Amino acid sequence: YPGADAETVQNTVTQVIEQNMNGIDHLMYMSSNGDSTGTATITLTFESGTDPDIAQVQVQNKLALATPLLPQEVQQQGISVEKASSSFLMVVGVIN
Amino acid sequence: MPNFFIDRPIFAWVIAIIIMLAGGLSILKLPVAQYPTIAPPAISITAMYPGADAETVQNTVTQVIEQNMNGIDHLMYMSSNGDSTGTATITLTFESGTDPDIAQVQVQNKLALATPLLPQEVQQQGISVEKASSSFLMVVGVINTNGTMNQDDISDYVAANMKDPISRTSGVGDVQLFGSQYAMRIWMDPNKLNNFQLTPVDVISALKAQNAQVAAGQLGGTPPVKGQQLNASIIAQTRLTNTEEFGNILLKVNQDGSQVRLRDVAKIELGGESYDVVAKFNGQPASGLGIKLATGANALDTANAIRAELAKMEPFFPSGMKIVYPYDTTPFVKISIHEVVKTLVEAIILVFLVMYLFLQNFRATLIPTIAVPVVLLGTFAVLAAFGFSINTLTMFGMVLAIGLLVDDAIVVVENVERVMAEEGLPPKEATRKSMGQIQGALVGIAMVLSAVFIPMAFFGGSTGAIYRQFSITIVSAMALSVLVALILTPALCATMLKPITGFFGWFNRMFDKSTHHYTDSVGNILRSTGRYLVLYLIIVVGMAWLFVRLPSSFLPDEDQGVFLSMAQLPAGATQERTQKVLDEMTNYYLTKEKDNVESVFAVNGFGFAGRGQNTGIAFVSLKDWSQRPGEENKVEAITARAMGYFSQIKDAMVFAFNLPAIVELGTATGFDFELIDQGGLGHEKLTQARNQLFGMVAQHPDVLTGVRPNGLEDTPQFKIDIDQEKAQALGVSISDINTTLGAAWGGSYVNDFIDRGRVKKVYIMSEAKYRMLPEDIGKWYVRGSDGQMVPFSAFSTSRWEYGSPRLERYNGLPSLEILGQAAPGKSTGEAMALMEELAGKLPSGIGYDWTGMSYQERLSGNQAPALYAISLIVVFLCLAALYESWSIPFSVMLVVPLGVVGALLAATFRGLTNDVYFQVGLLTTIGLSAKNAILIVEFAKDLMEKEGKGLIEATLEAVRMRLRPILMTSLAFILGVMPLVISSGAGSGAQNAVGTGVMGGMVTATILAIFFVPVFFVVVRRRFSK
Amino acid sequence: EDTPQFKIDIDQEKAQALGVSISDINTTLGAAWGGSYVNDFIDRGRVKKVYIMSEAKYRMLPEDIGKWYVRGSDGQMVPFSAFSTSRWEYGSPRLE
Amino acid sequence: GTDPDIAQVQVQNKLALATPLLPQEVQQQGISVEKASSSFLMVVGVIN
Amino acid sequence: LGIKLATGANALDTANAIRAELAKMEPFFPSGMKIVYPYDTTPFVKIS
Amino acid sequence: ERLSGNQAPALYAISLIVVFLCLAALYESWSIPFSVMLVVPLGVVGAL
Amino acid sequence: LPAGATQERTQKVLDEMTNYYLTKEKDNVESVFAVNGFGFAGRGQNTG
Ligand SMILES: CCCCCCCCCCCCCCCCCCCCCCC(=O)O[C@H](COC(=O)CCCCCCCCCC)COP(=O)(O)OC[C@H](O)CO
């Protein structure tokens, strides 16, 4: 949500998406945040053994219902759904 | 195996304990729902194009979406319709068993690719893809008692506060809000706009600018300057949030310098997104929440959680705002589950009582009491393993299977008791000898019942799913009953039973004399076997007569506590007239039926055939069943009385009806006929062909009855057509004219604004009084090139034309859905064939097709007889295997007509139909009668072989030994099913359908088999001897 | 933790008093201070972005706001000082 | 062994992020993400 | 129409479905029309 | 970690019950499993 | 770094950290890849 702050992002984007992203099968918890650059991140952790592909499909389905309620700028920018990990496998530094 | 566990009772107890633990854990972890997924997955696409008519919607939205629905797997058919409110609906029905999530995501992906082609207004509104085959667990209506705030305020309150807690409640898989949050509504005034020489184009342009977001950047952001110390984020927010701020928008500055603010040419206030629908609850403004149960969630727990949350939020509501529950399916589910559990417990108690009456000792009676619960718990564990739930179908499957379980336990225990009493053996040796007489029969019967029930699970469609629930439940129960009969009950008989005047003396003497008389009767019958084969043929002919003359059905209608009633005013009727009609309906319901009706949720501007201002609905909710005694207080009687009253309303076509048995599905009665346009003949030609077909079906009242459309007829419309020559001569752009007309009379969604931390729409539309009559077109002016104001009457012409308020398509072609049902006493197949024949005489370029229920009927009719043939062949092969002969099985397959006769007689006399419960009851009756015949024939054959007895002597001994367990099982099952037959309370339609057929079948089978099976055995043995 | 935020308020009434468009003000501020991604170009056979932004030394201090001029309706330049004011307020750079 | 449904879902999800950058003519014409190959199963000629 | 096969689909089932779909279209063809099949790879599978 | 700590006791209870049932089934008695199931506290004390 | 810190101060702190790792822990530490302006707790010029 370019040009927004944390409060506006939380009120108008993260809160709207969180409402619909709820009741998905094998959902265990979800934590979201929005920074001063206008970016909202919502992370949904599912039960162990859940199929990540079907989980992503359901997340996409629920999110698409929540899209028409967001600010038009968010629609223009686009919303990306992809499986997430926290820790790096490796870092490949390059020097001269 | 029985001999293995006769000497190892502890291992049998360990197995029983494992089964009990698995069943208890599964019961603790099984979902509870009224019904499972029956209807095929249907995904619905909804697109809103405000201010548009049916042709505009169909041409700009529905046609474009329908042309881009390629590469979606397992698609059965597709239908759509765009109504005059500006809403386009496209429904994609997929083959049964399709993954709903995959289907929905595929549809969404195709629509996301095909969205850039839609009008900017449709894209800005948003297109919704969602599952349409789901049903609402409950509807939570929120009303106002004081009468301070209208329904827009209530909808905003529920959206802002009540949606989040309800959505995050455990088990709530989806929450749908009936209504919408606020929206800044701007009501323009043409007189004032012309006063300052302005246009709705100018208001749209001056509203789009303000309330934008600026990426103001960052103070000291990278790449910095060497030595920077402070880094801060710049926040530039020129936002508008109040009505006063919106009224301060500047549109013009006159020559003298004065400023023309927005409030000078408009009335700005907070309103609703749309005003099409007005919902009331007993006459008060209301909103609502459509709560849908999740996947694998417990319905009762979810309902309790929702109620607890709503009660928690009660103290914080505004003044005089309360919660009401017009619709709720939890009380019915709870009553049904309790009734089934009570039936099972009563069946176990009755088994105990009959066992003590006949065997006369407590040690024997305790054994079935231990055996049957083990089988039930194992059945629950198996259901859990198969992904099933605890719903009406599986519960009634258990109730129907409670006959096989008690039959198995009774057979084993009674055989052991008879062996002990007659041969004077100890319990262990008597059990070992007894299990050697029936252990092969139990396996043969397991195979035979598997063959009888499994093929029923291979049907297709909605009926396929309904039959699969019953088939899996009953087959699992029977398999566990047979496994337990070979493992546990032999051990219990070996260890528990002890070696072997008054009322019991009298009963014993009476039963001994009865058995003597019965054996004498059978002996007399076997001397004239030829005479009684004619009686068997007469009975079979009567069975065929009753079966052909028995009306067919799908499921019995039930009193769920609620029913519907919808009005339909003539074409052109407005919202006030429909509200008057709905108020009359509500007054009738709350005055005449005050002792039956608890609330009326009158939804104005809504409908099922088609939305509009001239239609309405009322979800009448009745009181608790305990407050509605008698048949006069049920839903059917209330509906009939209302129909009697509503026929006098000479203002609308008001008629009430009950809900379907499965709301997920539709009526499921009659046929669904679509009249497609396969030659591009237009709407007029298609309507003429539909009228011609209606004229044709009117000539066959004996085959087709109640054939009617499922859509709205053509209605008058106001045609205003701009004149290009005059518009250009006066220097008026067509874009300006179209924007002015659309924004003034249909409304425009300009941009959004942030109020109380929520992004809310901004709408501009004319004030009500300036867009009501054809004479109001001349009140609106559009600015010319030179700055002069030109009225719509100087370059436009107006006339009244005709057009459809709701257009339809089927599989991408224009369509006209036609509904109806077959005349009494005629199968729906004949009505479908007649409709196909009559639709073939219609003009060239006009086709047809069958949708929904008719689709499923074709699919299942393609399957009906092959499964029966396979079942019969497999049963015959299993019986030939068991009896070691190709001819003996016919003495066991000829008992099938015996129980069916009784089932048909009971259904006919009681005036029931051939619904699904009837078929399942028939199958269980056939299975149990076949079990009895199998045991009789096997005992006779074993006597005739091992002990070298004669044919007649062996038959007589077999029937004498088998009489008692047959009577015990029949009495126990009949008594255990009698409450279902007599039940007439809540959800008693399914109970009666399940119980009456079973009771009649058991009565006739018990009376007839004991006298006919020996006849069949003797005749077959005589015929095929050498 | 909470960070200072340089809130700048645009007096629209004064903006039209001097004949300066709000759209022009927004575009000038965004492009000058936050940088604007205009379009792409081909660099050695790879598509890369084109960015426009103020030089570092002109977007550092709060008084650098008044160094930026926006053309009025009649073609006369107007500084941001003539139709805007700014203040410092605290806020959260990232809410959770 | 890859699931074609999930493969198409992921491909289209990644495409949805690049679509805003494409020209307007491309989007107006319409982008299609089919799960098929370069070879033809069959051809159905129609003549008068 | 050059028909391609969705990945993971059965060629013979798809060909049967297409040939059954066309049978619903022939009745409405304007006089002179005729469906001709100049290329098909499923008959080889069936006959082999 | 909280989930593991919460579900630890049920694991021990079900494991002990299953071992007792298996011993009773194998040894055809309710008393020999008891004689064998009283030795578990003698190993757990050592582990602790 | 404190709220409102700039890139230079974070880079100075990261340089201190790298110098410590490569001087005090030169026996155990082999390489330090200091990324300025990046973190797992949100982005910013005060983080590294
Ligand atoms: C202790 C635990 C025990 C648990 C046991 C549970 C077992 C339950 C398993 C049940 C699993 C079924 C799920 C399937 C669901 C998808 C079905 C798809 C529909 C199409 C099928 C039509 C068909 O395939 O149906 C005909 C096919 O055969 C048959 O039913 C087979 C009959 C099986 C007999 C079993 C006997 C076992 C005892 C032997 C000792 C073919 O005929 P068609 O119906 O296709 O059409 C006919 C027209 O000629 C053309 O239309």
Residue numbers in the entry:
A (entry chain C): 49 to 144
B (entry chain B): 1 to 500, 509 to 1034
C (entry chain C): 721 to 816
D (entry chain A): 97 to 144
E (entry chain A): 289 to 336
F (entry chain C): 865 to 912
G (entry chain C): 577 to 624
The paper states:
The tripartite AcrAB-TolC efflux pump is the dominant constitutive system by which Enterobacterales like Escherichia coli and Klebsiella pneumoniae extrude antibiotics. AcrAB-TolC is composed of (i) an inner membrane trimeric H+/drug antiporter (i.e., AcrB), (ii) a hexameric periplasmic adapter protein (i.e., AcrA), that interacts with AcrB and connects to (iii) TolC, a trimeric outer membrane channel. AcrB sequesters and transports drug substrates via a concerted conformational cycling of each of its protomers, which adopt the Loose (L), Tight (T) or Open (O) state. K. pneumoniae and E. coli encode several RND-pumps, but in both species AcrAB-TolC is the major constitutive tripartite efflux pump system and their AcrB proteins share 92% identical residues.
Non-proteinaceous electron density between transmembrane (TM) segments TM4, TM5 and TM10 showed BDM91288 (5) to bind to the TM domain of the L protomer in a similar manner to that described for BDM88855 (1) with E. coli AcrB. Together this corroborated the specificity of PyrPips for the AcrB L protomer, the congruent binding position within the TM domain and confirmed the salt bridge formation between the -NH2+- group of the protonated piperazine moiety with the charged carboxylic side chain of D408. Additionally, interactions of BDM91288 (5) with other residues of the proton relay network (D407, D408, and K939), L449, and the carbonyl oxygen of the main chain L404 were observed. Relative to BDM88855 (1), the second piperazine introduced in BDM91288 (5) was found to interact with the acidic side chain of D950 at the cytoplasmic entrance of the L protomer. The overall interaction of BDM91288 (5) revealed therefore two salt bridges, one with D408 involving the protonated secondary nitrogen atom (-NH2+-) of the first piperazine moiety, and the other with D950 involving the -NH2+- of the second piperazine moiety, as expected from the medicinal chemistry design. However, this additional salt bridge with D950 did not lead to an increase in potency. BDM91288 (5) is attached to the binding site via a directional 2-point suspension, which likely locks the protomer in a state that can be described as an intermediate conformation between the O and L state. The locked O/L intermediate conformation is anticipated to result in the inhibition of the interprotomer-dependent functional cycling of the entire AcrB trimer, thereby preventing antibiotic efflux.
